[PDB]
mmCIF file of C-alpha atoms in Angstrom:
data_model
loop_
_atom_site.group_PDB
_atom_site.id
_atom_site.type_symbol
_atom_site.label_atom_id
_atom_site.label_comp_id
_atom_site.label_asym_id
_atom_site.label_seq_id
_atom_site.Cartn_x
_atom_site.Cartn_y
_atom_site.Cartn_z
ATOM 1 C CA UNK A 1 104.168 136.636 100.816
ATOM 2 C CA UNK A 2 102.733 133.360 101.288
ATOM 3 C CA UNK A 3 101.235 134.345 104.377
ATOM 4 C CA UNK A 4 97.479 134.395 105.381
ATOM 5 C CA UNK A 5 94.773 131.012 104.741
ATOM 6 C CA UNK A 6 94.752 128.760 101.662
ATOM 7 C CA UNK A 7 91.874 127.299 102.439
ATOM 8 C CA UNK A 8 89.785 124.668 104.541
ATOM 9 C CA UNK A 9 91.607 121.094 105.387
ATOM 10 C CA UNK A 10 89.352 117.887 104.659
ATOM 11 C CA UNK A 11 89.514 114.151 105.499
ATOM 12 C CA UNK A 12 89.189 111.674 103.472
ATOM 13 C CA UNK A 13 86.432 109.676 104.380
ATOM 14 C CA UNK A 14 88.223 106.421 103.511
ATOM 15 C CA UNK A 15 91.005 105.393 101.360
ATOM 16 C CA UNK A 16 90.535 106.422 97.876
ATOM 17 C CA UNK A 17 91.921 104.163 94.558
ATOM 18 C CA UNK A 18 92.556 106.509 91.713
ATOM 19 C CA UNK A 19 91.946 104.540 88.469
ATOM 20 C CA UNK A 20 93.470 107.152 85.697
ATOM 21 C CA UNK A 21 96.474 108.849 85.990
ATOM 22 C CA UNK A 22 94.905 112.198 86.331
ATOM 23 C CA UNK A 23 93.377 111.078 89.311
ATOM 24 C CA UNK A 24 94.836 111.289 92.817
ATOM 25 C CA UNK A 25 95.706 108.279 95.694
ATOM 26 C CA UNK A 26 94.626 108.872 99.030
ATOM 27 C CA UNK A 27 94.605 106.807 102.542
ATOM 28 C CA UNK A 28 91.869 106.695 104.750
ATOM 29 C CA UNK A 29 92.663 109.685 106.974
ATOM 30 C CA UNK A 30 94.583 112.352 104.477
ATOM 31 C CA UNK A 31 94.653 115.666 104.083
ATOM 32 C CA UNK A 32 94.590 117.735 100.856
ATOM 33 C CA UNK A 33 94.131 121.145 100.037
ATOM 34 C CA UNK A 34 91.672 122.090 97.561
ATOM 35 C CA UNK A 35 92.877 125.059 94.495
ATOM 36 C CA UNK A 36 89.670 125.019 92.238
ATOM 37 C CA UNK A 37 86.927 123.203 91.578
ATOM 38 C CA UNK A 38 86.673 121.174 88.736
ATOM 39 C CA UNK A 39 83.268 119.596 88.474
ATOM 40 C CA UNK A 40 79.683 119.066 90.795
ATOM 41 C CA UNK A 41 81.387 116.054 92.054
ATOM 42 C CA UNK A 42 84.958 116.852 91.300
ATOM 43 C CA UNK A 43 87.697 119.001 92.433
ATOM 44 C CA UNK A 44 91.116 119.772 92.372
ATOM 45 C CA UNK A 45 93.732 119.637 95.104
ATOM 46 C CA UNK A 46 98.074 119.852 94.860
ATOM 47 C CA UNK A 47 99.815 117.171 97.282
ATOM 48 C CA UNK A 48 103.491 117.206 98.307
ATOM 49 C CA UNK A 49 104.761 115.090 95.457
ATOM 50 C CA UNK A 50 101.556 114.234 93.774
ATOM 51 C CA UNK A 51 98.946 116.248 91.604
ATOM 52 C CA UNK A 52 95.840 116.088 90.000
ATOM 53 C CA UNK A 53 91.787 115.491 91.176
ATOM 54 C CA UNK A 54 89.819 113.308 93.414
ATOM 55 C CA UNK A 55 86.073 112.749 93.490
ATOM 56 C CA UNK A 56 83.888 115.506 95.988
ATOM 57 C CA UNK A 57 82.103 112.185 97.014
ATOM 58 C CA UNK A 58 85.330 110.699 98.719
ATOM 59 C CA UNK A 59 85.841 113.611 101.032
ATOM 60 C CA UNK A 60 83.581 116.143 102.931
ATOM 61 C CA UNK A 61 84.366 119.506 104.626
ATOM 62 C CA UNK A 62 84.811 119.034 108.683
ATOM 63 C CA UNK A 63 84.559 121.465 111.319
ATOM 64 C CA UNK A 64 86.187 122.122 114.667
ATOM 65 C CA UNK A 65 85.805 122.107 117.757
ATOM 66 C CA UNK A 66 86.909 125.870 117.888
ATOM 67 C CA UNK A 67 83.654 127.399 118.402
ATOM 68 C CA UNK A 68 79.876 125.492 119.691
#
């Protein structure tokens, strides 16, 4: 019921312009959740109050602290 891990939080690396209107604006330290992937340097993400896809170039996958 909604309960368990969606999936792995990124950052943008800086703020992102989205040109089209399928494309998604970000700010320079954002997080968005990726759903499915769209293309080699695309993929898809769902943000409280705005939709659609951002470039795999503008963000990257960071780790944690949690373990060396």
């Amino acid at each position: 019921g909604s309960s368990g891990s969606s999936g792995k939080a990124a950052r943008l690396k800086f703020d992102f312009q989205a040109q089209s209107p399928k494309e998604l604006t970000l700010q320079k330290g954002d997080i968005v959740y990726i759903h499915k992937e769209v293309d080699k340097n695309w993929l898809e993400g769902e943000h409280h109050g705005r939709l659609g896809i951002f470039p795999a170039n503008y963000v990257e996958v960071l780790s944690g602290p949690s373990s060396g």
